[PDB]
Amino acid sequence: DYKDDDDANIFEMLRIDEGLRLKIYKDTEGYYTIGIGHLLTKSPSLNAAKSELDKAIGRNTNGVITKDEAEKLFNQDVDAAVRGILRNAKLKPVYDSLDAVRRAALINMVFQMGETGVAGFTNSLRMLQQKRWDEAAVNLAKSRWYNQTPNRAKRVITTFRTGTWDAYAASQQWTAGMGLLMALIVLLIVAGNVLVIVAIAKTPRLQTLTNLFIMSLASADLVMGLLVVPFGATIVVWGRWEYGSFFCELWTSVDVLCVTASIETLCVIALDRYLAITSPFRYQSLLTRARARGLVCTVWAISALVSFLPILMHWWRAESDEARRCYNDPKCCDFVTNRAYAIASSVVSFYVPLCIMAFVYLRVFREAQKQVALREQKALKTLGIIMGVFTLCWLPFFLANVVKAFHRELVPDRLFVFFNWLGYANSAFNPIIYCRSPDFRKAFQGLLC
Amino acid sequence: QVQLQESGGGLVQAGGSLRLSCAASGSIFALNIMGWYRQAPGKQRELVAAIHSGGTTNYANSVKGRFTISRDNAANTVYLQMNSLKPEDTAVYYCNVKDFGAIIYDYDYWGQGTQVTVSS
Ligand SMILES: CC(C)CCC[C@@H](C)[C@H]1CC[C@H]2[C@@H]3CC=C4C[C@@H](O)CC[C@]4(C)[C@H]3CC[C@]12C
Ligand SMILES: CNC[C@H](O)c1ccc(O)c(O)c1
Ligand code: NA
C-alpha cells in the first residue's frame, strides 16, 4: 500500500519494542496474529486466520508474509489508532500539537495500553501539549507504566523528551554489539568441544577409560553451544523469546538437561581420578568398560528426569501473577520456577556434584601431604583451577536460583541472567581444563596442521 | 629435566638371581607408580612389577612369588629383588615412573634399559 518515510520510522520503533513475526503466531490469549501484533481472528481455526490474512494482504500467503506486507498491516493499525485518537477529546489536542517523532511515541503508548489507558495520563498529556518536555519526562517516569515496563518506557520517554530516535538507535547499536559477543561465545564453545570429540574418535591412544567421561562432558557442552547458548542469546539481543511457547519448554529442558549432564560429568571425572590417583590397582580392575558406560547413561538418565519430565509435566510452574503472566505469554521465556523444583534441580545439578568434587579434591590434597622446594605447588595450582573455575562459573547462579525462588525481589532479573551466562561460559572452559594432556596436544596439532 | 638411572642388569645362569635398582633424579609428585617393564625379542612390552607410593603392589601372574618389588623410604628409588630365574625371562627390563602432578592424566617417565639374559 502507500508507505511514507514517517510510517517506516514508527514501524521500526515497534519492531524493536514488540517484535516482528512473518509467520502466523499466537498472542497471550491464544489468538492468531501476524506482523507486529496484528490480530487476524479470534477463531480457533488456523485456516480461518489464513483466510483473513489472504483477504487483507491480497495474496495466497499460506501463513507466511513479507516485511512489506507486515508494514501494510502495521500502517492500517496505525491509521485506526490515529482515528481513535482524533475522536477522543482527551488525546486530540495533545496529538494535534506534537511533531511527527513525538507523535509516534504517543501511538506507541496506545499500542501498549490502549486509547482509554493513555487518555488517563491527563497531566503528562497537558505537559506534552505545552511542550514542557523535561517536566513531562519526569512525571512519566513516576507512572505505573514506567514501573511495570521500565525498558519500553525509558525508550518512549526519551522520545518524548528529545524528539529524536536516539533511544531506538542506541538499542540497535547494543543489539548488534551483543550479537557479536554472543556469536564469539558460541564459536568458542562449539569449536573447543567439537575438537575434543573428534580427537577422541580418531585417536586410539586417547580412547582410554577416563577420556570416555571427558567425551560425555564434551558432548553435554556441545549441545550447550549448539542449542542452549544460541537461543539464549536471542533473548538477550532481542529482549524477547521469538519461538513460541512450545519451544520455550523444550529449550528450557535441553538447557537443564545439558547443565545437569555437564556438571555431574565433572563430578564423575573428579571421582574417576581420585580412584586412579589413590588406589590405581583396584581402579584398573573394578572400573570396567561397561561400568564406565554405566555411569554416563546414569548421568544422562538423571538429567532427562530432572529436565524433560518436570518441565513438560508443568511441575516446575510457580503460581504467582508474575509467573502465570510469563507462562501465558509466548514472547516470555524467563526462568520462573517454584520453590521445590528450584531446590531439587539445584541439588541434583549443582550442590551434590559440588560436595563430591570438593570432598574428593580436598582428600587428594590430604593424602599428597601425608606421603611426602617440592612439586606440590604445581599440583595445587592445578586443583585451584579445576575447582576455582567450576565454582566461580556456577556458584553465583545456583545461589541466586535458590534465593530468587523464595524472595523474588532480591535477585534482579538482569543479575539473574548474568549469573546464568557465567555458567554457560564453563562449557567453553572445560576443554581447556580437562584436555591438557600431551596426548591431546599431539592430537590437537594433528587435526589443525 | 628428570632422569632415572638403571642398575643391576647382567647375564646369569638359569636358577640364579639378580637385583635391579632404579634411582630417579629430579622432582616428582608424591603420588606415583614406579614399575618395571620387559620386552623380549618378538613379543611386545609387558609389565612385571609396579609399586605405588602407598605400598600396593601388582605382579604379573607369570612372575609373582619369584619376584618382589620394593621402595626406599625417603628416596625416589625402586628395587626389584628377583629370584628363581627361568630362561623365558630374557628381556630388556625398563624402569617406568607414573607422575601425577597434572591431576587429569598420567605422565610417563621411561628409561633406557638394561639387558638381562638367562642361560639355559
Ligand atoms: C557448601 C554449600 C553446600 C553451601 C551452600 C548453602 C546454600 C544453599 C545456602 C547458603 C545461604 C542460604 C540461604 C540464606 C537465606 C535464605 C532466606 C530464607 O528465609 C530461606 C532460605 C534462604 C534462601 C537460604 C537457602 C540456602 C542457602 C542459599
Ligand atoms: C534457562 N536457564 C536454566 C539454567 O541453566 C538451569 C540449569 C539447571 C538447573 O537445575 C536449573 O535450576 C537452572
Ligand atoms: Na512463555
Side-chain angles (χ1 to χ4, degrees), chain A residues 273 277 280-281 371 379 436-438, chain B residues 30-31 52 56 101 103-104 106:
Chain A
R273 304 307 301 162
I277 304 303
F281 305 105
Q371 294 176 356
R436 197 186 294 272
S437 75
Chain B
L31 280 74
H52 186 269
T56 58
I103 308 299
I104 305 301
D106 297 332

Side-chain angles (χ1 to χ4, degrees), chain A residues 251 255-256 259-260 335 345-346 349 394 397-398 401 420 424:
Chain A
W251 173 66
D255 183 1
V256 175
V259 174
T260 302
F335 200 44
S345 67
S346 297
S349 294
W394 285 109
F397 175 77
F398 285 101
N401 196 8
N420 206 167
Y424 289 165

Side-chain angles (χ1 to χ4, degrees), chain B residues 10-42 44-45 47-63 65-72 74-87:
Chain B
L11 198 153
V12 69
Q13 73 273 17
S17 67
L18 293 173
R19 185 259 183 85
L20 269 291
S21 178
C22 182
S25 66
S27 180
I28 52 89
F29 183 70
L31 280 74
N32 60 4
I33 296 169
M34 292 179 183
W36 292 98
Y37 289 89
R38 67 181 179 182
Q39 182 179 2
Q44 288 83 17
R45 188 177 67 246
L47 188 148
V48 292
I51 186 66
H52 186 269
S53 179
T56 58
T57 64
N58 191 1
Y59 298 104
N61 288 320
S62 69
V63 171
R66 299 184 295 114
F67 286 70
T68 60
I69 192 167
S70 178
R71 297 181 68 89
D72 191 0
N76 288 318
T77 64
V78 62
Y79 306 107
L80 183 57
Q81 184 64 255
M82 60 185 71
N83 297 320
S84 297
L85 298 176
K86 291 178 70 67

Side-chain angles (χ1 to χ4, degrees), chain A residues 177-283 285-365 367-369 371-375 377-380 382-413 415-441 443-444:
Chain A
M178 294 299 291
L180 187 149
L181 178 61
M182 293 298 175
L184 295 177
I185 293 172
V186 174
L187 182 65
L188 294 176
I189 296 170
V190 175
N193 284 309
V194 72
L195 188 66
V196 172
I197 293 171
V198 297
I200 305 298
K202 295 292 184 182
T203 298
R205 185 178 293 275
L206 288 173
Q207 293 181 357
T208 66
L209 200 64
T210 298
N211 290 320
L212 183 65
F213 293 160
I214 297 171
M215 181 178 282
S216 178
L217 180 64
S219 292
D221 290 333
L222 183 63
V223 181
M224 195 74 73
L226 291 174
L227 294 174
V228 177
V229 175
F231 288 94
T234 61
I235 298 171
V236 176
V237 301
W238 291 346
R240 289 176 303 275
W241 181 255
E242 297 295 333
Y243 305 97
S245 296
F246 182 75
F247 285 162
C248 177
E249 288 183 351
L250 275 69
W251 173 66
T252 305
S253 295
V254 175
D255 183 1
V256 175
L257 178 66
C258 296
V259 174
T260 302
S262 180
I263 298 168
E264 289 182 355
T265 299
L266 295 177
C267 182
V268 174
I269 292 171
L271 288 172
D272 180 74
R273 304 307 301 162
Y274 182 75
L275 297 176
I277 304 303
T278 296
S279 178
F281 305 105
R282 300 178 68 88
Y283 169 76
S285 64
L286 292 174
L287 185 64
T288 64
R289 184 190 66 188
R291 181 175 172 85
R293 290 187 292 112
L295 289 175
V296 299
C297 293
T298 298
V299 172
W300 288 96
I302 294 169
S303 295
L305 289 173
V306 298
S307 65
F308 284 99
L309 184 62
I311 293 169
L312 293 177
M313 290 299 291
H314 291 176
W315 294 348
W316 79 290
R317 284 173 180 257
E319 291 181 352
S320 67
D321 287 332
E322 184 177 0
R324 294 192 299 269
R325 193 185 303 114
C326 185
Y327 298 156
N328 289 321
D329 187 0
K331 290 182 181 179
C332 182
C333 196
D334 291 332
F335 200 44
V336 197
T337 184
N338 61 12
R339 284 98 65 82
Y341 183 77
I343 297 171
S345 67
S346 297
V347 172
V348 174
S349 294
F350 177 76
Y351 286 105
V352 170
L354 179 63
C355 295
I356 293 172
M357 292 174 68
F359 180 75
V360 164
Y361 289 157
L362 190 149
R363 181 61 63 193
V364 175
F365 178 77
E367 291 180 354
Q369 299 301 109
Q371 294 176 356
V372 64
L374 187 64
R375 184 175 170 83
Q377 295 179 357
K378 179 66 177 176
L380 184 63
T382 299
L383 293 174
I385 292 172
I386 300 169
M387 293 299 291
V389 174
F390 171 71
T391 296
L392 184 62
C393 289
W394 285 109
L395 184 65
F397 175 77
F398 285 101
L399 289 174
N401 196 8
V402 177
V403 170
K404 186 176 180 180
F406 296 6
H407 298 287
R408 182 67 63 190
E409 71 276 14
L410 289 174
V411 179
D413 292 331
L415 184 63
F416 185 71
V417 174
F418 179 76
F419 287 171
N420 206 167
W421 279 90
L422 296 178
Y424 289 165
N426 193 4
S427 296
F429 294 162
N430 287 320
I432 300 299
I433 297 169
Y434 291 91
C435 297
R436 197 186 294 272
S437 75
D439 291 331
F440 284 106
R441 293 181 184 271
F444 289 164

Side-chain angles (χ1 to χ4, degrees), chain A residues 134-165 167-168:
Chain A
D134 290 332
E135 295 182 355
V138 169
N139 193 7
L140 288 170
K142 297 175 184 178
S143 69
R144 296 177 69 191
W145 172 55
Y146 186 84
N147 291 316
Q148 183 63 37
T149 309
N151 296 318
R152 175 75 173 270
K154 289 177 184 178
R155 291 192 292 273
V156 176
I157 291 168
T158 296
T159 303
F160 287 123
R161 187 178 181 184
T162 67
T164 68
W165 300 103
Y168 292 93

